[PDB]
């Protein structure tokens, strides 16, 4: 289980559930452009995760996460309890 659902990065639709916290860029961003998290917000753009709708940070607090608990859009690369993953164009590096 976990790591399956979707996500999209340089290596688009990845595989991730995140069932049991995690999700960040590791899960995709690394799975395959290995990235890990700790920049923290206001230090990268690769985390730029394009509607998670999937892993729940929920300790957003100050440093971004998804908003509020389901909004990848923020550096969601420090979540919490992830519902399932889905991290779409996470950063294509361009921002069509």
Same mark, same amino acid.
């Given at each position: 289980?976990?790591?399956?659902? @979707?996500? &999209?990065?340089? =290596?688009? #639709?990845?595989?991730? $559930? +995140? ?7 590791? *899960? *995709? #961003? $690394?799975?395959?452009? =290995? %990235?890990?998290?700790?920049?923290? *917000?206001?230090? +990268?753009?690769?985390? *730029?995760? @394009? &509607? ?8 957003? /607090?100050?440093? %971004?996460? =998804? =908003? /509020? &608990? #389901? ?5 969601? +690369?420090?979540?919490?309890? !992830?519902?399932? +993953?889905? &991290?779409? !164009?996470? @950063?294509?590096?361009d921002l069509y």
């Amino acid at each position: 289980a976990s790591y399956t659902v @979707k996500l &999209i990065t340089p =290596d688009g #639709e990845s595989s991730i $559930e +995140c069932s049991d916290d995690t999700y960040i860029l590791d *899960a *995709a #961003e $690394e799975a395959g452009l =290995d %990235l890990p998290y700790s920049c923290r *917000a206001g230090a +990268c753009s690769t985390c *730029a995760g @394009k &509607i998670t709708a999937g892993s729940v940070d929920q300790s957003d /607090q100050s440093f %971004l996460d =998804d =908003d /509020q &608990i #389901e909004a990848g859009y923020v550096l969601t +690369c420090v979540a919490y309890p !992830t519902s399932d +993953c889905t &991290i779409e !164009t996470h @950063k294509e590096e361009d921002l069509y």
